């Protein structure tokens, strides 16, 4: 089945990212044995949730979802009236609250708005967490935009030295759409992923959050440049390669050069 999971991931990377939800759902129907694996390996549009109790919005994810309900990072309770939902250790929950507050400022310092959520889950010899960040552009402008941030770091605390190994794996999801007459319907979404590993020192002045923050910041900053290059860079270039507004100075050389090289294989080979 392993190969199946690999094929499923490759398929999602081929199919339009604009229908990840629908596709993902269908993908599961074809293989109900890869639902969980797919519900944790396939990145989809970050959904926004509201916390009546707190009255705050929180993003959803497979890291903070138990069955059919989600766990709020504010009140620490699943939306759907659950009974014994999975919850982080009292000690862990505390660190999670600080992480949400710490990142909360990092969101208004880089995004100046939007929503953010952080979920942690103890491990075998350490602990992991996921940093979500959603920011929507002006909803009054002709062109719409949405920035989804999905970071999944894996801390590997060390027995001695207090030095832990960090393994981040963010994956920004840029979405761009516009319904203009001159451009009727234009959709330019997607998402880039980049891994990063490095050993850092854990201290009072540089705790986990601090270390995780530096990585996320550097990761986003690096992905922020690649997105502008690929999006408003490669794609565009590829578009200009398909057709051209100005008459392309026909070239007989290429064609005349291909005829020779060709007849070479059709009349030879080797």
């Amino acid at each position: 089945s392993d190969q199946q999971l690999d094929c499923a991931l490759d398929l999602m990377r081929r199919l339009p990212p604009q229908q990840i939800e629908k596709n993902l759902s269908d993908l599961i129907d074809l293989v109900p044995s890869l639902c969980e694996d797919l519900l944790s390996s396939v990145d989809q549009p970050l959904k926004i949730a509201r916390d009546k109790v707190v009255g705050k919005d929180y993003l959803l994810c497979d890291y903070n979802r138990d069955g059919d309900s989600y766990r709020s990072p504010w009140s620490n309770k699943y939306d759907p009236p659950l009974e014994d939902g999975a919850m982080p250790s009292a000690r862990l929950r505390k660190l999670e609250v600080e992480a949400n507050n710490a990142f909360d400022q990092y969101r208004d310092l880089y995004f100046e708005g939007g929503v953010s959520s952080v979920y942690l889950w103890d491990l075998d010899h350490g602990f992991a967490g996921v940093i979500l960040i959603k920011k929507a552009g002006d909803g009054s402008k002709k062109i719409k935009g949405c920035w989804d941030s999905i970071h999944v770091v894996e801390v590997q605390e060390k027995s001695s030295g207090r030095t832990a190994h960090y393994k981040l794996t963010s994956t920004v999801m840029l979405w761009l759409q516009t319904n203009k007459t001159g451009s009727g319907t234009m959709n330019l979404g997607g998402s880039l992923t980049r891994q990063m590993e490095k050993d850092e020192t854990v201290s009072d002045s540089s705790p986990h959050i601090a270390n995780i923050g530096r990585l996320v910041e550097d990761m986003e900053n690096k992905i922020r440049s690649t997105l502008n290059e690929i999006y408003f860079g490669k794609t565009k270039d590829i578009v200009n390669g398909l057709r051209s507004i100005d008459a392309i100075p026909d070239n007989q050389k290429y064609k005349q050069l291909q005829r020779e090289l060709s007849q070479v294989l059709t009349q030879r080979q080797i």
Partner: protein
């Protein structure tokens, strides 16, 4: 600090907030974010009442140099054009820093922006 509360004004049209800053001593020419002027956000979405403001004071109606473009056009690709009108009323000429015939020509096709050219 308060960078947001400052720019957030030229957005929601908090002409009441931006009026506090300028209330100091004519200060409409600084680098809003890091390379933009407090006239782009106002024009793009300044209720058409914020632009005429921080505008009557200084004159960022052309101060733009590194932006290789004026704010007048900013409203063009906005659909507001409500400002561009009462704008030129102060001069803003029509093509002081425009690529050329772009202005309204290579800008759009609506009669609103066209209000200049043919």
């Amino acid at each position: 600090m308060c960078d947001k509360e400052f720019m957030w004004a030229l957005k929601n049209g908090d002409l009441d907030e931006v009026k506090d800053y300028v209330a100091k001593g004519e200060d409409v020419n600084r680098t809003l974010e890091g390379g933009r002027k407090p006239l782009h956000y106002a024009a793009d979405c300044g209720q058409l009442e914020i632009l005429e403001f921080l505008l009557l004071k200084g004159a960022d109606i052309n101060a733009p140099d590194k932006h290789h473009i004026t704010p007048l056009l900013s409203a063009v690709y906005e659909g507001h054009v409500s400002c561009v009108k009462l704008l030129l009323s102060k001069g803003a000429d029509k093509t002081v820093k425009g690529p050329d015939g772009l202005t309204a020509l290579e800008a759009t096709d609506n009669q609103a922006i066209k209000a200049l050219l043919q």
